[PDB]
Symmetry: C3
Subunit: 386 residues, 3 copies
């Protein structure tokens, strides 16, 4: 199940402590065993954001209610609607052709005024991610039940007695993956994505704040059509739900339940501190067989590529030789691997793995394995554009 720890990942001092680096990814786990000591399976479980705070609320499907139009004959100054006293009504002062047929003195421009009640049927919510909202749950399995603990960015360390290992301090910080700072959690009544903060602000839709409950910038979903002497019909523009869904293609969708817990991606770099202890360092070989694409490589909103492979061999457990090259005539590592340890669990028949890499901008080949039987994939990465 869990892949053993390697020699490079731990240092036993001649006197003092034995420090061991743990790379806890959502995919696989790292197990650490020691002579005359119980084996410890280190598996991360929940990378979440407990509770979020709302920043803004844009409206895409607005509905106009009560209308009222007051007009006055030309050469009599201006027209004034008595709904402007209430800031919850959007109004517009215009001019119309006037004559004897409508009931006025001179054939001129008669000033009018038309107000309408602005309400919002369906709205979208934008939420922010703060440091006191992030939690990480790590499970530890023992052989020879389990013991679980949690760590936050405010409390990254955890000390606990683990039997024959004595007191153990586990200091873990979060790395790689997404950058929670430059992102907002966009929420439609159905799904939820992650958008850029500047992309969120720069949006010409009627919005409201938890501090300012009254809607602002409403003059973008309302349309004042051709005015008449009596009634100037103003209508509510169509639902902008389609436009948003069209604008949210390259946005990365995060799983959000009713408790607003945000399941995210990335990895967790942890270091375990123990008393002086010798540890078995297992070293895994290379996969000499051939891999095949389980499906088409997807793409997340942070310029990384998720690729699901399936190994056709029994040399497990081994290390996947995946690299992103420039051309088929170059084995030059012009790409990078987000997944630090791309090992296969067991060697039982046909298994599958979940690897994530960062290819350079432009044309690049995702190549797995070598020799005569290797496969590749032409990938074109787009530049940054909100």
């Amino acid at each position: 199940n869990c892949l053993g720890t390697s020699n490079r990942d731990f240092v036993e001092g001649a006197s003092g402590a034995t420090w061991i680096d743990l790379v806890l990814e959502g995919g696989s786990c790292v197990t650490v065993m020691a002579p005359e000591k119980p084996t410890l399976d280190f598996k991360v479980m929940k990378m979440e954001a407990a509770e979020l705070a709302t920043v803004r609320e844009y409206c895409y499907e607005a509905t106009l209610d009560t209308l009222s139009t007051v007009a006055r004959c030309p050469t009599t100054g201006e027209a004034h609607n008595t709904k402007r006293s209430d800031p919850t009504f959007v109004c517009k002062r215009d001019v119309v052709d006037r004559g004897w047929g409508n009931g006025c003195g001179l054939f001129g421009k008669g000033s009018i005024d038309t107000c309408a009640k602005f309400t919002c049927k369906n709205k979208a919510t934008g939420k922010t991610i703060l440091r006191e909202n992030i939690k990480y749950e790590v499970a530890i399995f023992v052989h020879g039940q389990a013991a679980r603990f949690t760590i936050s960015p405010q409390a990254p360390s955890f000390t606990a007695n683990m039997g024959e290992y004595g007191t153990v301090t586990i200091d873990c910080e979060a790395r790689s993956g997404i950058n929670t700072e430059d992102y907002y959690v966009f929420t439609v009544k159905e799904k939820s994505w992650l958008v850029n903060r500047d992309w969120f602000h720069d949006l010409n839709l009627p919005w409201t704040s938890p501090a300012t409950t009254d809607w602002r910038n409403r003059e973008t979903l309302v349309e004042f059509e051709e005015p008449h002497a009596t009634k100037q019909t103003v209508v509510a523009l169509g639902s902008q739900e389609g436009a948003l869904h069209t604008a949210l293609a390259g946005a990365i969708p995060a799983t959000v339940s009713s408790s607003t817990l945000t399941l995210q991606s990335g990895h967790l770099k942890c270091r375990a501190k123990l008393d002086k202890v010798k540890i078995k360092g297992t070293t895994y070989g290379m996969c000499d067989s051939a891999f095949t694409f389980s499906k088409n490589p997807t793409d997340t909103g942070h310029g990384t590529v998720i690729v699901e492979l399936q190994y056709t061999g029994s040399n497990g457990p081994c290390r996947v030789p995946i690299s992103v090259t420039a051309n088929l005539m170059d084995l030059t590592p012009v790409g990078r691997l987000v997944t630090v340890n791309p090992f296969i669990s067991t060697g039982g028949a046909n298994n599958k793995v979940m690897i994530e890499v960062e290819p350079p901008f432009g044309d690049s080949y995702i190549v797995v394995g070598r020799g005569t039987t290797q496969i590749n994939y032409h990938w074109h990465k787009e530049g940054s554009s909100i």
Copy 2:
């Protein structure tokens, strides 16, 4: 005074160097001694932000000065005040009932125009925290005076010769506590708090910039009352100081002097690099006695709980067994400790400690000690809401 270093916190290689992790918190200090080597007390002192830059200046107590109202008879177009040429005056064009009693031709709507001088008596200042503003001062005591140095996020490392230890490189970065990015330093002439950046922007008060000295969005502290044919009395709204103080309940207050140095919270993780040297590793036991609440546990603006305890025993120096559980029937660590090392200095009679923890959202119990004589505290943490 200072608590000794533990076995886990240092690794002496068979050849090369001896690395030791130092967890420097504002509360206690970490002392490191070695055979035939002088003892070294590592104590952090100043976690500050030297100088800050102002971003905006909101006005809450505005004062209106010179008023002027120009009106014209109905059916004569519009009214135009000659103060609109000066952008430092807020104006409003309205209409009033007019007749023969006031001195006009027809009984209609006479257009008027009323301007007023806008000035700001008392204002609040919002300042930002940049990386070149943060400084950390660390003191080192020797036994057998002292040596002090400073580190910034731009210069986290410090190398200096320390006698028998030879050249010593101390590499320290800041962790946990607050996130200085998503916060602004709000400043009233009296106190100073820390607010969210989005909470700062989304504020409907007249504001000015160091770049734009002229006040903008002033039409929110002015009130145009019922207009008359001669003078339309417009007044300045009451002081919004009370509203701000009401809106700044859950905001964390930071100590700021006239030099704008911001005393903050969190901890400093440092690693000392020395030549190969053996170090005495002192291990402290558990507190078997009973703790009592010195006072009621407070709360900071970053979802953490400060709790002041007092130990009724003489087993010092020992480690405080404080944990945040879900229920009284569960000893499950559902909470976390921001304070990494919650040790007691000496064992002399009744001493006090300063522990800070991060409880999960909702109901949670803060439990100290075990056995028959332990105490707890029901705590309800609120969700994130600017």
Copy 3:
């Protein structure tokens, strides 16, 4: 060429691994050799930002095109220009003196309306820096060709077989220097600087978005002069290029080519993981000679000082004794060094080095060397002010 590794920078466990800390700066490199093992020169090369996304586009040199003015006699309501139907035209309704000479009934205020086509000749571009845009290229030289690799914040680790050293994992994260979060890349058709995000938003110039192609806030580069009964001449304000260049003095200029790759500053902290291996630890002495200023110490936009020195001696390779003190009577390190390892490469005659330090705010002396023949420099650092 490269300075050897020091004893403090590596720990060889009695069993397991040998970890070595590498401080890779743009200036010098760190070479690590081992008995019966080939020497390895670790040199960083490219600290860049591959591709950037545009956020806003301000206009400083606008040009007005087609003008049109429609006026109507007084006591006839208002005037209405038929260009307001097109939102690409900026308009203004004003009043003028009217009489029999111009062709009207009564000597009163005749309402007019003047519109003009708003276009932008030259514009400035503001771009943002995201995590998927940052890349770091590191070169490794071997003696007894070279092997190069890349690392991103999403993929900071790199594992590769290096002959007799076996599998080697190099885990590197970025530290110090600039903070890419609070900065935007300002781009004029000529040069490119780095400005603050709040300084970018708070700017009263006509701006456009990649989402909103139509220009907004144009009423700041247009000037409506004294109006006449026929034509109200409105002109385009002069080029604001001079004002921007005046406002961009303390802004740090980054090298940007046509591929928008941003050459930046700071340093890269890396740790190499290898199997158990003994490493030669070379220790360098102190420079007893005298240094001289090659040129006047410059200043970057992040409150650090670049100083170029030249060593007049042959004691190389040695360590430069540069420190920032308060007064000439105090050797107190009140300043800090951004450059971690300020060593000199060879000792051949007169060589030059590139040191960067962070002096405290206010008066401070940059002192190099000691004894009778040392030199200093009075430096006054300004406070933070956008």
